[PDB]
Subunit: 472 residues, 4 copies
């Protein structure tokens, strides 16, 4: 029986959810495509159903969004920022139940579910002010009586494809900034977080309808692979923002490039921690634990590779092993719990395979490596030592709490080993040596977009620039 | 016999050119690939030869550039700007002979050849100041004792592929900004402007060498499609700037994306002029003429489509026919010619093809349309009427002076017609109606990246990589 | 008897007001200086009393604010922005009663009173985002291993002196931006809007107190010229923001400069409207009316001079006379009135003085010019013609609805006439001539800081101090 | 006899100088005011004469500058930047003789005279690019169909008053930026550097005349106090840039404020060096020597107060004393010399008085303190120890090489002592302690505008901003 039909989950109805939910919103709610059931990863029980977009739904929705844009693009940016402010306030009102739904359907602990909704709220609060800052300079022409104007306009329709692990806030960022920039949006979320997508869209739709705005400004088309591919290939989708796996993202980027569209790609990858000989272990161990096991190792920034100096290697591994043992585990929406399940059964399979492949490559499991004997998709947070830095399994990005630990002797080699990684998303170093930090942050250092040490024009990405020369 | 071997062309030696020139520079000059002879389009005589890059040349050069980068990236941005300043000074010193070479090998008139070198000089002067402005903010973190730093670093090696029609200044822009940003560069110019590429590289090389810097900071590998494709597929080329045809550019773009590299593409597109009923004809006619026939119609920005209201379509065409009659065509060194030869014999064939194809699709040639019976690649400035706004030949960007003219009734018509084209390059409107102007420049107006009205500073971030660095100083 | 003691005014207690209120806040409420009773200008009845700051109160408060700063300056800018966000939320919660108080004590109509509080709310919402944007660049030094950092720090204590006509939002802007910049503030509002200042401070104080922050971050010392002068001469007041009359502001400016402090002065100036011969009268007449009589002519931006071409001077005045006849004047709480009473009885006297003085200088009162025979400070919306553009009374900024009208022949005349005034505040032109518009907005046009055409993000740097920090990391 | 009449100084004629020089330039050269003779401080010999502006000259020049502005303001900013580029090139051509004149008339060593001309060249090279960056954004209005434009216009006439110690490059900065911003300028330099002012103005005037521009765009009115005061009180001088002493500058600022004008004031003051216990003395001593004795202690940034930790105090003083002894002294234009004379006889008097007052306040002269027995205005570079931090003589800014040395025990006190100074121009700390550097650079640290550790919108200052709201 569906969780939403059990009295103990009656709070779900506060988000306007029912047994079967419309998964298409374009000003009207509908869905003639396949009906999907999503499941709670903490107990593998069905929660509720969503009727996804058909091809026809997608086509209709794109057309309606583009018609809505004619109205929306004419609303001045600060007034669009006011609408985004109101979306923020509406999320505020629902933050506990929406955060609870994030934990229920996705599996991250309650403080993280609520925190993700809060992030979207904070983004909306930020966008309000940013909406008053959109514009380009009037530059002087070389010719007298001529004006040189850097003009910024909406791109039109921004399609947004998001992933399971941040099913609210990635959409939130894209939506908020695309909206103040005068674009309309079309959201396709992860199918396994469809209820979350629907719940967020219901909140936004009410704000739009209360303001007598066409709902298709924030359209929703729940669906699987065929909907995502359609967006990628659709010339009417002026900008496609994709967050997800590298394999899918690469193909999305190629499809967009083939039709001369624009894309924003967040593909994540491997994240490394490097603890040098002089690191403060009081920081390294709790940092590595949180970065490794937080959200059950399913973050884009999850630490999967830990490089430790030979001297402190064993102590750090020991203290990690001790730290891992005291990790509290349960239903993620129970305020007591610190560690929840993996998002799907498939991820549990990937976890087991990764552990096996790691052993078959020469690694020793010094902690965990097993599925937990309990309902749901729970696995033990795992530490593997003895692997070689060039190990194939280590370079692959399995969304599971497996920490691969590598030793090193000097700065030169470990820096080389890391710069040999391409997909690198973030690098976190722990050292007290200043010259070393500079080298790692500078031109010859990390290639990562995010670098951490011992721990503004974003709107232009959603607009198109023109140079306008005007003769008085 | 080679022009460079004739006494009257002895000035070419001021640019360090000889009968057979090395087309590879990486700190040393060389070239083991295929020879190419380039020709003067004014008389179709061979100028001199360049030995292009082999695969081994390319490999060695990419390696030397990346080694050079280790030194160059450590030189403070303002010191890099001083080098670029010296490059501008060195170009100044050679501006007349380098300008004359552009005219000799590529075929644009001398004021434009010199003017193109001057643009590169002005870019270097600009880059000097810009080099003191490169960096990102330190922002306060929400967490006490933490700092958020927006860090900008060089991408590494910037490959630069350029086209025949601006064989100096496009490279110049890319080179100057890439340099101050701490990158090293690798240039592959158009094969038919190989001498120009060598001459520019000789000028830059001497500045680098005089400053005791590794010359591969500004490397050159002359070649054709094979070198260009190698660069596009090469992971060591961190950023690839391409200027040229849409067909080639699209392939280059896909290859770079396949390896998750970075590209900057300039693929051009068509350029339209729209004269409304209330347009000042005093502006419309000369603006259209110069935009259409400047550089013999071989600019990226060349106007190839002129929409005129049914109202004044008849008159503007008549006034254009009379004005076109007075266009003087001739040798690029002649101070009294408006434009010179097409760049290639092939381009002349393309001109004749477009003219005939236009006729087959119902067009009337109301002026020009013929090849001039004289040595070189000279064609008449041409105007074609009666075509439909969707005629497949008018949307083809023929690099020749062919101006297609269309009539229209309403603003809604012509605006739809014009935004039916796939990402045109520039739109130039002539009107007095200020509401129409706000419309055309606004969100529901032209999709072109260049819009002009009554006429025919963060750029460095494109050449760098951003990181967000969070530092716990508590 | 005090309005606040009458049952129908019991809503004032929602703002924490009583019969006699403390006018000093520095974390605790107090006030040992002189009492002041403020009056409702709609009926000239006393509302309630405020005990103002003594010298001892001021001293203690400045000391407590500077002690509070030691804590506040260490709170990360985005965390400071979250406090300002909460202040905006707290204002929202009280917007109707706080708006009603602005209308009750100051006299502007309720939609403007509420609208003024809404502006402060919108400013707080804006400041939240701006707080994440505060900082300067790290630039590369010309010297290897050296870094150039543009560092921004709070100035310390920001004194804020505000005027009667916007007794909430001017303080709000200064307070919100000063706060996110890491400064503490000290407010001295207009004496005749003391209850408003106390009410706003009570709202902010609760947010600070609830957040366990020292309340003197947003201190209040109610007083008159003596407190204002103390702030101007006080070295501990690092930055003094003053809004008010030019005469007072100039003195304040000189006092601050004498001690090498920093000031921000808003001194207003006149506001002119220029309707040319080609002006759309459909715009001119209502724009002029609303600009002239909005808030009973008591805005800094109130239009007091209307220049009209000799061409249409006759008609626009006639159409204005008819429109003025339909202006409804009455109680600020009445939703169907365009404006209410003047702020003070003295202002009514000033109105009559200007009207008579105008007549003595040759002016014709073509509409209004009288005091309305009813309780409160009500005057008729007034239009005066026949004055010369240099008449000394028309250049006086009388805070009352008096509109002086002048005719002119040529553009050169009216532009000279208008830029003869000493730094006017705003210029609003109505014309179709686009060249005239470029002229008026350009280097040889208006010197006003506000220019409007066919209508009547680094700001945080003003509240901080910049340092260039060079660090040898080699 | 005048130096310019001696064959050995015939190189002066390369700058267009003669026995008596016109000190007014407004497109024509003139001067009906007082005739001044300037003197070489290395030998107290007269160099040449300059006929200064009368009141009438000043009045005429202001009017002509303002007429020239009508033409100049209509030249697009990048074309104005080209004129500034050409001024740069023209200085380049004269750099050796102009630098030599700086050494001759002002007294700073040759490398510094040439270096100051080079700074102006570099400023011109910078201004060329900056000229393409002048403008404000078009921001979105809250009202539909309305445009919000941040407009920047020239202020008009920028008066520039400069001092003896940087008689070329301060004017150069003001001139170059004011020019690209579309302003005309009026220069009044230090009377004791009048030949330098004339020589620079001749270089600029030729560039303007070659370009068929009205010379008054860069006007010159040489004069003393009455000319400076006239500029300060003149409503036609829209912006007054003053560099000089605090007493004069304060009065200039008050005069400008009285008439609601705009001013830019550079008043300099005291500069302190703080060497903590952990400082690298290998840096501290040569840094202190150069900052103290460079340009004979006549820089705006000259170090006059040295705070040293008790532990290293004596060693640093010793090594300074040893370093001071090997200082090479001679004619400043002789390429061999490292230390020249003070700029005037009056400064030598101030030097002697400061030394005497320092003794009478309790200080010990551990080196120097005497005038040198030789022609010119030469004094010994001086180190005074034993003074109290609150000493009156130490807080005063005498343009002479007197280094006052103070001891301290801990961070708290020395920071307090320094924050007790108001006029503080720069602060230079030497320490390896990171927390300490942060404290000194942060909100609770130095109040100085320039802070050194172990060693862009400038155009807006010369323009006026308006907010322009336009209804389509
Ligand atoms: O005009 P074009 O696009 O045919 O040429 C523009 C530039 O691209 C180069 N080029 C031609 N074919 C290429 C290819 N297949 N890949 C990369 N570059 C190529 C040319 O040599 C020229 O420099
Ligand atoms: O309109 P106004 O300028 O007379 O008043 C504006 C503000 O300045 C204050 N003020 C009045 N006299 C002052 C003075 N001498 N110094 C400083 N502030 C003063 C007022 O109290 C008010 O808050």
């Amino acid at each position: 029986t569906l969780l939403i039909n059990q009295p103990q989950y009656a709070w779900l109805k506060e988000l306007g959810l029912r047994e079967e939910n419309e998964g298409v919103y374009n000003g009207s709610w509908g869905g003639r495509g396949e009906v999907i059931t999503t499941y709670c990863p903490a107990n593998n029980e069905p929660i509720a159903r969503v009727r996804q977009a058909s091809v026809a739904d997608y086509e209709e929705t794109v057309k309606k969004a583009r018609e809505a844009w004619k109205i929306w693009a004419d609303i001045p940016a600060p007034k669009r920022g006011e609408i985004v402010r109101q979306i923020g306030d509406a999320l505020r009102e629902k933050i506990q139940v929406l955060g609870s739904l994030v934990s229920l359907e996705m599996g991250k602990i309650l403080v993280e579910g609520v925190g993700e909704v809060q992030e979207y709220v904070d983004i909306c609060d930020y966008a309000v002010g940013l909406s008053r800052m959109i514009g380009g300079p009037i530059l002087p022409s070389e010719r007298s009586g001529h004006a040189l104007i850097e003009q910024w306009n909406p791109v039109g329709l921004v399609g947004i494809i998001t992933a399971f692990n941040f099913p609210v806030a990635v959409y939130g960022w894209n939506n908020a900034i695309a909206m103040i920039c005068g674009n309309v949006c079309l959201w396709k979320g992860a199918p396994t977080t469809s209820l979350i997508s629907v719940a967020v869209t219901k909140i936004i739709a009410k704000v739009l309808e209360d303001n007598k705005l066409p709902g298709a400004i924030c359209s929703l088309t729940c669906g699987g692979a065929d909907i995502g591919t359609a967006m990628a290939k659709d010339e009417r989708v002026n900008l496609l923002s994709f967050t997800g796996s590298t394999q899918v993202g690469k193909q999305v980027g190629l499809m967009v490039q083939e039709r001369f569209g624009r894309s924003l790609l967040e593909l994540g990858g491997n994240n490394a921690i490097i603890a040098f000989e002089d690191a403060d272990l009081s920081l390294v161990v709790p940092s590595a634990l949180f970065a490794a096991v937080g959200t059950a190792g399913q973050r884009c920034t999850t630490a999967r590779r830990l490089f430790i100096h030979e001297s402190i290697h064993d102590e750090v591994v020991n203290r990690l092993k001790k730290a891992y043992a005291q990790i509290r585990v349960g239903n993620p929406w129970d305020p007591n719990v610190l560690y929840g399940p993996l998002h799907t059964k498939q991820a549990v399979s990937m976890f087991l395979g990764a552990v096996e492949e790691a052993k078959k490559e020469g690694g020793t499991v010094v902690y965990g490596g097993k599925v937990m004997d309990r309902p749901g998709n729970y696995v033990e947070p795992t530490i593997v030592t003895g692997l070689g830095h060039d190990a194939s399994i280590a370079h692959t990005e399995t969304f599971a709490p497996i920490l691969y630990v590598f030793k090193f002797k000097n700065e030169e080699e470990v820096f080389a080993w890391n710069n040999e990684v391409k997909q690198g998303l973030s690098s976190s170093i722990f050292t007290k040596d200043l010259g070393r930090i500079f080298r790692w942050l500078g031109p010859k250092g990390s290639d990562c977009g995010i670098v951490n040490v011992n721990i503004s024009d974003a709107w232009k990405q959603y607009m198109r620039r023109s140079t306008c020369t005007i003769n008085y």
